[PDB]
Description:
- The structure is cut from a larger assembly and holds four copies of chain A.
- By secondary structure, chain A is mainly α.
- In chain A, 70% of the residues lie in helices and 0% in strands.
- Chain A is built from five helices and no strands.
- In chain A, helix 3 (27-43) packs across helix 4 and helix 3 (27-43) crosses helix 5 (74-100).
- The longest helix of chain A has 27 residues, at 74-100.
- Chain A is flat, with a radius of gyration of 15 Å.
- Chain A starts with a helix and ends with a helix.
- Chains in contact: A-B, B-C, B-D.
- At the B-D interface, helix 2 and helix 4 of B face helix 2 and helix 4 of D.
Amino acid sequence: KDTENAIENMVGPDWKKRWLYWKNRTQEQCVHNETKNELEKMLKCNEEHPAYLASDEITTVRKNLESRGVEVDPSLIKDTWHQVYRRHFLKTALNHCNLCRR
Amino acid sequence: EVISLSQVTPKHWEEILQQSLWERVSTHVIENIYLPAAQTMNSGTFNTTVDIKLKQWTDKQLPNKAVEVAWETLQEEFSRFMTEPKGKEHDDIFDKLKEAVKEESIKRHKWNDFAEDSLRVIQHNALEDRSISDKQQWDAAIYFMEEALQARLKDTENAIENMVGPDWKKRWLYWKNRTQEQCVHNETKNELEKMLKCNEEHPAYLASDEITTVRKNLESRGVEVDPSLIKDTWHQVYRRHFLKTALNHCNLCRRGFYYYQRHFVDSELECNDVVLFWRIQRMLAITANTLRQQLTNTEVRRLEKN
Amino acid sequence: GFYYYQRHFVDSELECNDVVLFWRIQRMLAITANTLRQQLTNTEVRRLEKN
Amino acid sequence: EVISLSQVTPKHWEEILQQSLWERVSTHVIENIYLPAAQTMNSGTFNTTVDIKLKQWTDKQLPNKAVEVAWETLQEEFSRFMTEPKGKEHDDIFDKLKEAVK
């Protein structure tokens, strides 16, 4: 929950709140949301991807964001990856506990 | 027969020499002069870059290839006049002597050693004068330039189809499939096409960030590609992209200027490639005439004498 | 019309050359004026002040 | 860049060499051997004439055109490496020496 709240701060609210309380994302928030989406797509091909990212992946994500109109600092991608990967690992560990209790 | 060869009209010599010589050097200008010059949006640099190459190229290669074409062109017609059958009637009993005579006569057929010096001056002047004030000059130059570019486009496209293999239309129609390399090329092509889909102005040179990202957008789909495969794929697809753009540029160059109200619209349609093509077409046409004059004034007589 | 668009692949009735000439004249005059202004403000105006 | 050229894969070399030499010899073959030979209805004399002309062309012209192709292709690749890369990052300040050395 701590990671998810930091993530929401990083990327801002979803449409459920933007079109309900008339809020929007900051440019940093949209950039982080797109980087998170790219990293989620990456993790949906390798759910066991290690915590460490190669700079070639940072370059792969930067160019995809450019193809989506977004240019980012490598550390922006690194921090988004840190938070989202930790969230993913925690969800995986929680399902692992759900199997452990069985 | 050799006298009959001396009766060949200049019209045939000039057309044959011009057509043959240009075809020999049609790709050198495109690949080594035009296309790299097309990588900049500065038309002045584009014209400056090619003119320097052409003059250096002109001094070293053009008159040497031009004479060789003329030397061969005369022998090509000579052989046809000499030993070609009169349809189904032919005295083959004479062919041994005819070819034997030719070999001695061609060995003694030493083309004028100073023909190249005249051509260099001619070619420098033909290239130096870039003033095309006549619409007909423009019309002829663009259509022939299109044919050369269309030839390159099909040459690249045919190479690509082998590189990528048949599409689903032929795979299912003829019960064919792709090799694992073709499968890689199709996806490698698709990623490059998507990159160009947005970055239409992407320069021909690829950054290793692009080669690695193209390799990575493919690994994410289970496709691992060596960088060398991407670069080889890139070169063919880029030209197909570029060439279609050039032909569309040519289409608007003729059509856009053709519409009368558009001549006072100063759009970014500087068809400097038609200027380059036109001068070469004229330059070679003059070269052929100089060769033809030497061909009929000195060289054919030497052939007859030999 | 225009310098380039009047010529290439068009049946222009114009053949305009005066515009290029006087445009070049404008550019030469502007460059000369700027050079003169630089010379003035660098040397000549302070020379006059010293005098 | 010259070392990089020296490392170019044989596949590219052979493909470009074949394409260039074919460009050079296709019309020579078609016009001087194939079509003239086509006038006869006896495929055996057709083949005999074709082989004789091919042997003579090999003896006198073909290997010289082949060497020309190899040399000029090497020049073309060498210029591509030496000359301005087809990009935007190039610094022209080295062009004088690169072209003079080329």
